[PDB]
Amino acid sequence: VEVGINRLGVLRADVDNLGQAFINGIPDDYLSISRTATFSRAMSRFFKNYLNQLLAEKSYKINVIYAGGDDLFMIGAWQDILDFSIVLKQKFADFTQNKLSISAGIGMFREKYPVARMASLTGDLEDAAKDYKPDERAVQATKNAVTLFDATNVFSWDTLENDIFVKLDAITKNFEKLDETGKAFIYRLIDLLRGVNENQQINIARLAYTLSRMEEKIGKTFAQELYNWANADRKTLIMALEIYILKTRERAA
């Protein structure tokens, strides 16, 4: 890879409540050993065979360690892993036609990072995604989520795809003609957005000033769009901005 940060991507996906589906997912009337075997074979053949075939469809830079049953462990270029996470979610949702959900954790590590710690950390992220519960009123976690590089960046799959990826696409399409001072301006935007929690007024003013400085190579309309996002959807905006910085980092790859 030529553009991005020289980082390995570790993906760990797991179907939510597959054991519950095997216990009581099938209605009691349609319970037989043949139906149970059909469901088991569907799941197993999907994971093993179809993950192989789907990753062979386009030359993803992935190095699948294990697919097996209900689980997944793949290591590759972090951009390819991030791109294939949504493809995996969509293909699983098609295959099950939205009867089972999948949780994933995506870790980002350097090449010489310990493999034991890669596995442990990405498992922790996958557990955090399985801990996803948007409202503290329901019973049992929603579990249909993905964790992005850190246990604080747990987003649902719909949230991830729609919000984060449309924001990342807009940022990419509006930030490609920035200067090398613009990169530092994006860094400052990220720092200000992270600090907004402990600085309500001065920090939003500083963000407005930074957008003012930027709105000469990005346009006034997108500066206003970023300002609106910062006051409405901040954590998604921070996620998209960090992903853009890591994807466009010119420190080899």
Partner RNA sequence: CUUCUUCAGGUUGGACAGCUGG
Binding positions are 14-15, 17-19, 40, 66, 70-71, 130, 143
Q: Which of 216, 220, 224, 252 binds RNA (CB under 7 A)?
A: 216
Strand residues in the chain grouped as ranges (E): 8-15, 71-77, 102-109, 145-148, 154-156
Distance CA 212, CA 178 (A): 14
Site for RNA in 6-35 (CB under 7 A): none
Query: Could you tell me the two tokens for 221?
Result: 């309309």
> Considering CB under 7 A, how many residues would be counted as binding RNA?
5
Whichever of 146 and 214 has its CB closer to Mg ion, that residue is 146
- Residue 145: helix, strand or coil by DSSP? strand
Nearer to RNA, 3 or 37 (CB): 3
User: For residues 180 and 198, which CB has a smaller minimum distance to RNA in the complex?
Assistant: 180
The whole-angstrom separation of Cα 20 and Cα 67 is 20
Q: Which residue from 201, 204, 189 is spatially nearest to 239, judged by alpha carbons?
A: 189
CB of 147 to RNA, least distance (A): 35
Question: From the list RNA, Mg ion, none, which binds 179 (C-beta under 5 to 8 Å, kind-based)?
Answer: RNA
In contact, 102 and 88? CB cutoff 8 Å: yes
SS3 100: coil
Q: Which of residues 156-215 bind RNA (CB under 7 A)?
A: 179-181
Q: Which is nearer to Mg ion, 14 or 163 (CB)?
A: 14
CB of 71 to Mg ion, least distance (A): 4
Q: Which residues bind RNA (CB under 7 A)?
A: 179-181, 216-217
Q: Which residues bind Mg ion (CB under 5 A)?
A: 14-15, 18, 70-71
